[PDB]
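Hi W., the calcium ion complex you wanted:
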Amino acid sequence: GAENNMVRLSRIIIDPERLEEYNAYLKEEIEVSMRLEPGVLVLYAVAEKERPNHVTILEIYADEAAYKSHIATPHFKKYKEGTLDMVQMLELIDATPLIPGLKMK
Amino acid sequence: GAENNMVRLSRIIIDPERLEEYNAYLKEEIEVSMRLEPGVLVLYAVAEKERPNHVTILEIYADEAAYKSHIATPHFKKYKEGTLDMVQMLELIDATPLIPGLKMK
Ligand SMILES: [Ca+2]
Ligand SMILES: [Ca+2]
Ligand SMILES: [Ca+2]
Ligand SMILES: [Ca+2]
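Structure:
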């Protein structure tokens, strides 16, 4: 439920020359995850308008089991392997939501 | 609709000695905004577990008119004035969602 969801921010810097390829892989992998995995509650990615190769993803998983299952999926594998040479920085920020379970209108 | 929503990340660093007071003001202001303003679609605040005085808020407004109305409200005023001496850094990052209108499950 809301009280044990794993919430994380991923902050990524992508090689500017590979940004189109990266976005193609990322968008597909998010779409498949949202479609197929009940434990993936959101993968909400945004690109900074001033620096479009700086992407932040708000990640909410039902629990750590859901997260571990997610990173074993073929769709996550395709993304992780496909983009390995495109990522310049990856920051993984575990976080606590101020209002657990707050949803978008 | 999804295609003209104003999406922004606010990254804030709060004076560590004022963090409890800050969170009280922030949580109240988010709760009131979500309750009262149809144009505030989400204010999803998280605190970094390693550095709890580092807060990131995913902000989604229906449009720029909704945002301008929000910052004129008495509840936003109370928060902005109440926390003015507690904020050490404020970064306002306009952003483009990769999947406009994606919602949390
Ligand atoms: Ca849960
Ligand atoms: Ca390069
Ligand atoms: Ca809109
Ligand atoms: Ca201090």
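Chain B has one domain: 1-105.

W.
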